[PDB]
RNA sequence: UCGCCCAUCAC
RNA sequence: UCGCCCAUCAC
């Protein structure tokens, strides 16, 4: 009745079921273990786990229509704003044993809960420190193909830019979840999104921009490339 | 000019070649946190003094505040994060640490994340004692559930009991196999058994005298084995907790009053043996000096307090409270000095709680 | 078992030390509680000192044995701090009690000192 | 006397409380950068959470409640002492971090004057 | 003279920044004292910061210059904390003052920022 | 008064 | 089956 299928993106999967609508899924990096109480399917020599889109915006953005997705099998990536890492579990599945994942968090106690889970998910490294200050973890990170930002502090444009000075390779990609209301609450979100576009386009090239409506409100996803 | 990573410390010139490299003389997370947050450590200090012996007078580092401490140490120091030493190490780590490099980055990154939070107990050795009693109680309940697991799985494969004597190897076998037809050379060699042990088991699977448990039954015996492997993982978390907890050891007087009063009471008793041999009704008046002297020689006014006077509730409070707190404080200090001399075991958060409670009682009274 | 009870006490002399406190109470010169014990254990000529067996933390009275070895004085112990307070005549507890003059207890202190000095030897 | 060295936080709040407060800020750098208004509330746990997320009353104190002139003390003064403690604490961290000189018994004398004035006023 | 200064200045720029405090206070948005300066510094919102040359102990303001590099905002100094407090309208002193909105003083604060970016170099 | 990340329990 | 507020009291 259920069927597991490939998505239009390398390493990303889809399930269809007893209602028959598409749900987003990943091929489990460590078969048998749970992370958040996910929906799962065991299969012909394999196991597949679902990402519920109401649990992280990046799932909802892929359902809405995000097309320029750069996180792919065997790539190297640095991510800021991970907490206990439900997001990180699904990019751990998509990237596999061939790649490299760093996850940086500023909230000190919520990162603690990921520490035993990475003893199985050994393609993730969890790191405690201020996402706005790259120098505070400089010895335990390397150059990467991709950066992702979803701390989405008031500083988040500097979080993305300064980590992309230090760690992003030439030709490499960036992603940012622009939390309009935490950068400036005094103006219409399209003015906030226009300053984020005009600051990022003085260092990166912008390749795609998405408002999360009609799924969620006043938050946006931007994706970019360094020359 | 200089840069640092997970395994060491490296100096490269302004054209881009290596001058010298060092490795850390203490556990890497413990040294790297200091170098990451912006302060100097002896291994980086010995490298930058080697560059000063080799005749380099100007220095360029990665972190703005490590650079600030480097000029305060007497050097022409500045900051430029894109510099060749760090740019090479972070661009081509396989040139310096080899094609396994991410495994050492991982091993210290998770350890730094375990270290970037404070650790301060009131009862650390008593917590270790309960962890030691837990380690014998955990091994004892593993033995109990393994005795049931042996007997119940012997209904479905009775030849296994004599054949796998090692208890966690029997647990992990039943956890991953469940039903007896999932037994293959591949899964036994992943579980790390020898080619000899695999020349049996498979020979017995083709001829077993055991009964039949259904798929619906045998998963219950698989779940029993899975919860015993949960207990074996808890067993390691107890062993690894004690391996950390034995670093948090301290003296009591440093926590109950601190050095300004602790080292004064030791010096006015002449030593810490002598302070431990003193009564509360002399510890109250140690360092009263001219007031104790003339209370003796001329029979003058008895000293209400000595060097204890600058305590957090004496030199800053009404006269009604100043006299009562002085002798209560000297009582709790006479306990604390005897603890720190005769046994050296830590209880000082309870000695603090009792001196919170007696001063709260002085508050409901006065 | 605390570190200060350094010799095994028999079914004798312990009750005689309790009795020595009871009869010194109105007839000798005596101090009670461990800091007053401590000063009358340093200063002047103490005759005997008594401790409880249930003092906790043990560290508060753990000083009394080495302090008796520096100054040639005997010590002994009894099964409870609440009974030692009741022997001194106070409705709280006492961790220790000290004899400055025995009063009636002088023959009891002589028998205890003679028998303990050859026990520990 | 010219070979002496002593930390300030270690004398103003005591070593174990100083060492704890340095980590609720993330580091001694942050304790030497942050404002007294934030240093006042470091590690208040779920009382700070409900002040932000649920819009409750601000917490009067975080881990500075373990300070030996706040922990035992009556309500009238606990808040007034916590504010002046957070200022004098921010100074002591700035001295230990930027200067590496020692003034901690002066910093104590000033907070002790403010505590005497709190008794003289309330 | 304190440790925390990064470039030399005459009374030039400094008397003009004190003059900017004397008109931003009642035409714009301002805060006074170093912990309010530090709130408006840490959360970025201060467009210009002014600090004293005579702070005692000097260490209480010593974070404001490097923290204004870390967030990318201009900073300047003035010769006496009591006169900076009086320019901020209060009757005590102030070790620092922060401009959140220049009010009428925009061309003047933009001159100060443009000429301080000749020295932070 | 509102935003996001995140565990756990559940429909 | 679960939550809030005024007055008074305490560290």
Automatic annotation (TrEMBL), chain D:
Residues covered by the Nop domain: 5-120
Homology family: Belongs to the NOP5/NOP56 family.
Name listed for the protein in its UniProt record: NOP5/NOP56 related protein
Parent-record interval covered: 248 to 369 of 402
């Amino acid at each position: 009745m259920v069927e597991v299928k490939k998505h239009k993106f390398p390493g990303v999967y889809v399930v269809i079921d007893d209602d028959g609508s598409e749900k987003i899924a990943t091929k489990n990096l460590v078969p048998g273990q749970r992370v958040y109480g996910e929906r799962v399917i065991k299969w012909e020599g394999e196991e597949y786990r679902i990402w519920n889109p109401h649990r992280s915006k990046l799932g909802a953005a892929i359902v809405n229509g995000l097309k320029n997705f750069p996180i792919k099998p065997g790539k190297s990536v640095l991510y800021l704003g991970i907490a206990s890492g439900t997001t990180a579990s699904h990019v751990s599945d998509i990237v596999g044993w061939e790649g490299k994942i760093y996850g940086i968090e500023f909230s000190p106690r919520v990162l603690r809960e990921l520490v035993p889970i990475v003893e199985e998910r050994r393609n993730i490294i969890p790191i405690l420190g201020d996402a706005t200050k790259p120098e505070e973890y400089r010895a335990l990170v390397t150059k990467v193909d991709v950066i992702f930002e979803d701390v989405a502090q008031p500083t988040q444009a500097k979080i993305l830019i300064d980590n992309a000075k230090a760690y992003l390779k030439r030709g490499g990609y960036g992603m940012i979840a622009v939390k309009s209301r935490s950068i400036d609450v005094t103006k219409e979100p399209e003015q906030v999104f226009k300053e984020v576009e005009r600051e990022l386009s003085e260092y990166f090239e912008v390749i795609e921009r998405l408002n999360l409506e009609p799924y969620e409100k006043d938050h946006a996803l931007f994706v970019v490339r360094k020359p | 000019f200089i840069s640092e990573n997970v395994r060491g410390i490296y100096a490269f010139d302004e054209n881009g070649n290596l001058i010298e490299k060092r490795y850390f003389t203490d556990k890497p997370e413990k040294v790297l946190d200091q170098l990451l947050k912006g302060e100097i450590t002896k291994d980086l200090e010995e490298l930058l003094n080697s560059l000063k012996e080799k005749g380099y007078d100007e220095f360029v580092f990665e972190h703005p505040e490590l650079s600030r401490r480097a000029k305060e140490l007497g050097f022409s120091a500045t900051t430029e994060f894109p510099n060749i030493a760090g740019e090479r190490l972070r661009s081509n780590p396989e040139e310096f640490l080899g094609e396994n490099w991410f495994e050492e980055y991982y091993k210290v990154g998770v350890a730094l994340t375990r270290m970037r939070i404070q650790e301060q107990s009131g009862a650390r050795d008593k917590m270790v004692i309960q962890a030691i009693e837990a380690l014998d109680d955990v091994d004892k309940v593993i033995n109990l559930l393994v005795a049931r697991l042996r007997e119940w799985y012997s209904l479905h494969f009775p030849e296994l009991d004599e054949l796998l004597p090692k208890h966690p190897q029997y647990v992990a076998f039943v956890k991953t196999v469940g039903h007896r037809d999932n037994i293959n050379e591949e899964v036994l060699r992943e579980l790390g058994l020898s080619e000899e042990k695999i020349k049996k088991i498979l020979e017995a699977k083709e001829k077993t005298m055991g009964a039949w448990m259904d798929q619906t039954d045998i998963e219950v015996v698989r779940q029993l084995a899975e919860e015993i492997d949960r207990l074996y993982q808890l067993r390691k978390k107890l062993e690894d907790y004690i391996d950390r907890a034995m670093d948090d050891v301290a003296p009591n007087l440093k926590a109950l009053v601190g050095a300004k009063l602790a080292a004064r009471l030791i010096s006015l008793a002449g030593g810490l043996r002598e302070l431990a041999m003193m009564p509360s009704s002399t510890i109250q008046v140690l360092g009263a000096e001219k007031a104790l002297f003339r209370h003796l020689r001329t029979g003058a006014k008895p000293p209400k307090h000595g060097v204890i006077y600058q305590y957090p509730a004496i030199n800053r409070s009404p006269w009604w409270q100043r006299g009562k707190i002085a002798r209560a404080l000297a009582g709790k200090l006479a306990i604390a000095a005897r603890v720190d001399y005769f046994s050296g075991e830590y209880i000082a958060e309870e000695l603090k709680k009792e001196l919170e409670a007696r001063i709260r009682e002085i508050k409901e009274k006065y | 078992k605390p570190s200060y009870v350094k010799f095994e006490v028999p079914k004798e002399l312990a009750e005689k030390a309790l009795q020595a406190v009871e009869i010194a109470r109105d007839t000798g010169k005596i101090r009670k509680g461990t800091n007053e014990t401590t000063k009358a254990v340093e200063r002047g000529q103490a005759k005997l000192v008594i401790i409880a067996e249930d003092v906790d933390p043990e560290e508060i009275v753990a000083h009394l044995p080495p302090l008796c070895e520096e100054k040639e004085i005997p010590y002994i112990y009894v099964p409870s701090k609440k009974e030692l307070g009741a022997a001194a005549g106070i409705e709280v507890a006492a961790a220790s009690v000290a004899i400055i003059e025995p009063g009636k207890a002088r023959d009891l202190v002589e028998e205890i000192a003679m028998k303990v000095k050859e026990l520990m030897k």
